[PDB]
């Protein structure tokens, strides 16, 4: 019928109960503009839907209604790589056509193609600290945890720009058996960050194999929160259709959490703690639910989201709830970035739950896990020995604190230092990590096997 009222971003219009849940509807205004949305709430003689175009300026009695009768679906095809589109899936940003040979509806999963085995193949990004300390798999997800004041766009642009040169060397090692794709979806970012990421992607040479999703803060939050589901659905449809491991970057997580956390006071739902709604765990788990092995046993989906904290505190629901759903995370310390080591991602709180399944005997060294665990324990022991040695001084410094601080300074200034385009292998990083870890004594090292210690010091 007509629109009853409007509260916040969602519009409460009155109509019949013929539409279903997630049914596409069109609202006609008297100014010559049409707005499309999805029915999020259906009731008797009234409905509550969120429009993807605009958040204000809706008529009450001078508006018309039109029923589409089709559910909300994203058109995915095998030619989406090499095009620019908006957050609503429209070709208005000077990109390719939005046509697709296939159309599948979304309700949380396209076919529910979850993996039923552990990931064996390991994907290298070109960083000795990131790939060495966190063995990323073909289905495992590892997000980057940063703060307000750190170059997260340079780390994500360096990780995305590293794909294209380390992948041909890693393909010969049996780490990958197909072509790689990239899915970039921007939400709540500036024009300089999207132009710098598109300039780095065009300068790297992956413009025809990557996807461009541009979402700004001036657009609606429903289209910004719906853009990562369409980008992950198009990346999962391209990875399932082509049998190629696709890497998806979801940045920023604070804009997607702020989009769902924005409509929490203009509805009949009771929000949770910190102002966010109580259903944020299902929305955050919905992005991680579309990751893992794909159908066919030749394709997988990689999740590498960028999370920026809006307060710089580690006790938050976005970092704890987002990091609790994924397997591990990569934390960026301000102390490492303030000294000058690039990148500032430290391996102290970083870890990988599937690091043992990602490493094998044909694509990585067998002693990489013992040197990674001994280097991870020696990094925290060197940080605690440097922190105790800084306060204590040189009057009560232990003998192991000098070798731990020397190995922490040499490992932080040797293994942590790396260029934005310099390629590095895990075999040379393990050989340099064995020589850097060889300064410790044999009695101190007790977290490794005796055959690996006798074979290499």
């Amino acid at each position: 019928n007509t629109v009853s009222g409007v509260n916040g971003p969602l519009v409460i219009l009155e109509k019949v109960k013929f539409p279903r849940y997630n049914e596409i509807v069109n609202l006609t205004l008297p100014d010559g503009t049409v707005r499309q949305g999805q029915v999020l709430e259906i009731r008797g003689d009234r409905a509550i839907v969120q429009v993807f175009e605009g958040t204000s300026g809706i008529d009450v009695k001078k508006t018309t209604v039109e029923f589409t009768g089709e559910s909300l679906r994203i058109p995915v095809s095998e030619d989406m790589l090499g095009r620019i589109f908006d957050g609503s899936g429209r070709p208005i940003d000077n990109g390719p056509k939005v046509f697709a040979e296939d159309y599948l509806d979304i309700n949380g999963s396209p076919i529910n193609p979850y993996a039923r085995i552990y990931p064996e193949e390991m994907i290298s990004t070109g960083v000795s600290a990131i790939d060495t300390m966190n063995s990323i798999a073909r289905g495992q997800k590892i997000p980057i945890f940063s703060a307000s004041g750190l170059p997260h766009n340079e780390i994500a642009a360096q990780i995305c720009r590293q794909a294209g040169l380390v992948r041909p060397t890693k393909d010969v090692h049996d780490g990958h058996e197909e072509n790689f794709s990239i899915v970039f979806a921007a939400m709540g970012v500036n024009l300089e960050t999207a132009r710098f990421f598109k300039q780095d992607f065009e300068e790297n040479g992956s413009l025809e194999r990557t996807s461009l999703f541009l979402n700004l803060a001036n657009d609606p939050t429903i289209e910004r929160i719906i853009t990562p589901r369409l980008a992950l659905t198009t990346a999962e449809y391209l990875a399932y259709q082509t049998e190629r491991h696709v890497l998806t970057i979801l940045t920023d997580m604070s804009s997607y959490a702020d989009a769902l956390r924005e409509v929490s006071a203009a509805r009949e739902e009771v929000p949770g703690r910190r102002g966010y709604p109580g259903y944020m765990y299902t929305d955050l788990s919905t992005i991680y639910e579309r990751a893992g092995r794909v159908e066919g046993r030749n394709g997988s989906i990689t999740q590498i989201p960028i999370l920026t904290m809006p307060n710089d505190d580690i006790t938050h629901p976005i970092p704890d709830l987002t990091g609790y759903i994924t397997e591990g995370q990569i934390f960026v310390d301000r102390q490492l970035h303030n000294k000058g080591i690039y990148p500032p991602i430290n391996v102290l709180p970083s870890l990988s739950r599937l690091m043992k399944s990602a490493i094998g005997e044909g694509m990585t060294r067998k002693d990489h896990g013992d040197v990674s665990n001994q280097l991870y324990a020696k990094y925290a022991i060197g940080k605690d020995a440097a922190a105790m040695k800084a306060v204590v001084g040189e009057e009560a410094l232990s003998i192991e604190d000098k070798l731990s601080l020397e190995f922490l300074e040499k490992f932080e200034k040797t293994f942590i230092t790396q260029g934005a385009y310099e390629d590095r292998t895990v075999f040379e990083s393990l050989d340099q990590a064995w020589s850097l870890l060889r300064i410790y004594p044999k009695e101190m090292l007790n977290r490794i096997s005796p055959k690996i210690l006798d074979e290499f010091y």
Binding site: S4, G5, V6, N7, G8, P30, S56, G57, I58, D59, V60, K61, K62, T63, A147, S148, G149, P151, E154, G188, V189, N190, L191, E192, T193, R195, F196, Q199, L216, A217, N218, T221, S254, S255, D258, A259, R261, E262, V263, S264, A265, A266, P271, R274, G275, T308, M309, P310, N311, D312
Partner: protein, 593 residues
């Protein structure tokens, strides 16, 4: 149109909603008070009022303006002070004899007491027109006109009638557009919503090499037009002197001053202090007041003008960027608009959030920084425009760890600190390299280095020399000066002279508020060459007193070169800094042998 059904608190409810949108602003009652319908519930509309609701009874008429709440873009904008809701204080001082907006009084959005001469551009009868194209020219000042008459965005058609040259008012029409029959009448003033971003041709990265008039700020980091940078404040701890000295010492075509939640004392000192200053653009016609746009809203005003003040200033800066000119937008501060959004949300009935801030402040903070930027100008001409956003940060919750400064620091890509001891030392600004950072110096040093720059090598060695001298000052203070190396005393001596000559600036003369890039690059190259020649001479065997006493008039002459005129080499190059390299090389060769 509508009738007043009920009034509860500061928000008035009006019934008879038969098509009124929830984005248009209307005046309820016969007083024409400012208000806007934030939401609607059935037949009755909920309108938030930013003023006193005394004298409004049940049964008052409600008339909508027919458009959303935005600012008007027309000629005669410089040398005028208005509010965020299009309320001129000059008409209130003439008619009402007051400064604050009184209840039951309404003024026009554009001043109808001053008329400008409109000239025809390159559009003839029957020529094609589009949105953003230059249709003509309008005089905005007595010395030079900068108000470019353009069509509204998202429109096109054919010019069927073109008016001739002459002076006309803003209310009268001067042009008519024909698109699908009789489209509408066109005038000098145009409408634009404050909550809608202005369109453009294409957005790009901020790489425009434009200076802002800061010698120490431009020397420490390369200034660009179109970037995002935040500055910390303390409610009058030195941010007003840096904003007034940056706006007065700036050499851009336009300046945008936005006062959202100021106390009112700096607004009168900025308006009265702006005409007394002398601009550096070759003109004396009140260039500090005429060359800048003043929008000042105090703390005794409505929250709609203070919240929409940054949107109106960003919309005017977007219109000036769309006209084909680079403008600098300086707004202080976003804490008053963030507190006004929570104050309007609490009175309207919105739910709370973390730290007492609303959920829309995160999207509005990203949309505010995403609204400004450098890109191509919209229209058939395709001109170059840029909008530099300078927003001040202050506490609004009881500390500096609020989500406004935290989300603004993470959203922005440049940070500029401000020390209180440096502000007490008469140094403005007092930011250091260890409490600030910027990632856009590669593009500004790439283009400015592309013209004739030496800013990269002197800037990296200057930042490393200041960071080494700042760490060496604590070791020289605690441990002493009888056990350190001789290079640390030369690095601290060069850092003290570079920080004293570069950081020490309070607008003492015309040469201290406007320095060229070649003079700062030669001044930093002379200090870097003097520190490198002193370290190379001390490394080969020499005394510190022999080099310090061997310099003599060169060190005092190098510090006193900033008070002279910059026309030494051709028109902007310093000729004394070029001859200092031969005396530094002769003193370094004489000190070694």
């Amino acid at each position: 149109y509508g009738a007043i059904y009920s009034v509860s608190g500061p928000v008035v409810i009006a019934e008879n909603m038969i098509g009124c949108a929830m984005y248009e602003l209307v005046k309820v009652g016969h007083d024409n008070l400012v208000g806007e319908v934030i939401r609607i519930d059935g037949d009755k509309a909920t309108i938030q009022v930013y003023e006193e609701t005394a004298g409004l009874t049940v049964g008052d008429p409600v008339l909508r303006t027919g458009k959303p709440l935005s600012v008007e873009l027309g000629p005669g904008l410089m040398e005028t002070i208005y509010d965020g809701i299009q309320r001129p204080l000059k008409a209130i001082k003439e008619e009402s004899q007051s400064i604050y907006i009184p209840r039951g009084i309404d003024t026009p959005a554009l001043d109808r007491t001053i008329k400008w001469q409109f000239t025809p551009g390159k559009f003839q009868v029957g020529d094609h027109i589009s949105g953003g194209d230059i249709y003509g020219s309008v005089f905005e000042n007595s010395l030079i006109s900068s108000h470019k008459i353009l069509l509204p965005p998202r429109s096109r058609g054919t010019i069927t009638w073109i008016a001739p040259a002459g002076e006309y008012t803003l209310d009268e029409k001067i042009l008519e557009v024909e698109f699908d029959g009789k489209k509408s009448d066109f005038t000098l003033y145009h409408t634009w919503p404050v909550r809608v971003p202005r369109p453009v041709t294409e957005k790009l990265s901020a790489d425009y090499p434009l200076l802002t008039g800061q010698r120490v700020l431009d020397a420490l980091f390369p200034c660009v037009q179109g970037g995002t940078t935040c500055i910390p404040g303390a409610f009058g701890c030195g941010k007003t002197v840096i904003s007034q000295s940056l706006s007065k010492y700036s050499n851009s075509d336009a300046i945008i001053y936005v006062g959202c939640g100021e106390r009112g004392n700096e607004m009168a000192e900025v308006l009265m202090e702006f005409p007394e200053l002398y601009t550096e653009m070759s003109g004396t016609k009140e260039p500090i007041m005429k060359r800048t746009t003043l929008v000042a809203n105090t703390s005794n005003m409505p929250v709609a003008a203070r919240e929409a003040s940054i949107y109106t200033g960003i919309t005017l800066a977007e219109y000036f960027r769309d006209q084909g000119k680079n403008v600098s937008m300086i707004a202080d501060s976003s804490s008053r608009w963030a507190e006004a959004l929570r104050e309007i949300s609490g009175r309207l009935g919105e739910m709370p959030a973390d730290q007492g801030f609303p959920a829309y402040l995160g999207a509005k903070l990203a949309s505010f920084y995403e609204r400004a930027g450098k890109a191509v100008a919209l229209g058939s001409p395709d001109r170059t425009g840029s909008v530099s956003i300078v927003a001040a940060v202050s506490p609004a919750g009881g500390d500096f760890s609020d989500p406004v400064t935290t989300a603004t620091l993470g959203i922005t890509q440049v940070f500029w600190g401000l020390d209180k001891k440096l502000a007490q030392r008469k140094h403005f600004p007092s930011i250091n390299t260890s409490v600030s950072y910027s990632k856009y110096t590669n593009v500004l040093n790439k283009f400015y280095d592309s013209n004739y720059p030496e800013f990269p090598v002197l800037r990296d060695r200057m930042k490393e020399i200041l960071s080494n001298a700042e760490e060496l000052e604590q070791v020289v203070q605690l441990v002493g000066k009888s056990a350190l190396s001789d290079s640390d005393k030369i690095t601290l001596d060069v850092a003290t002279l570079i920080k004293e000559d570069f950081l020490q600036q309070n607008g003492y003369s015309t040469y201290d508020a406007f320095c060229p890039i070649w003079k700062t690059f030669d001044m930093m190259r002379a200090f870097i060459s003097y520190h490198d020649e002193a370290q190379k001479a001390v490394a080969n065997g020499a005394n510190w007193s022999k080099l310090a006493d061997s310099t003599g008039d060169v060190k005092h002459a190098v510090s006193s070169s900033k008070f002279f005129e910059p026309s030494r080499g051709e028109k902007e190059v310093h000729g004394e800094f070029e001859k200092l390299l031969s005396t530094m090389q002769e003193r370094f060769a004489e000190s070694t042998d």
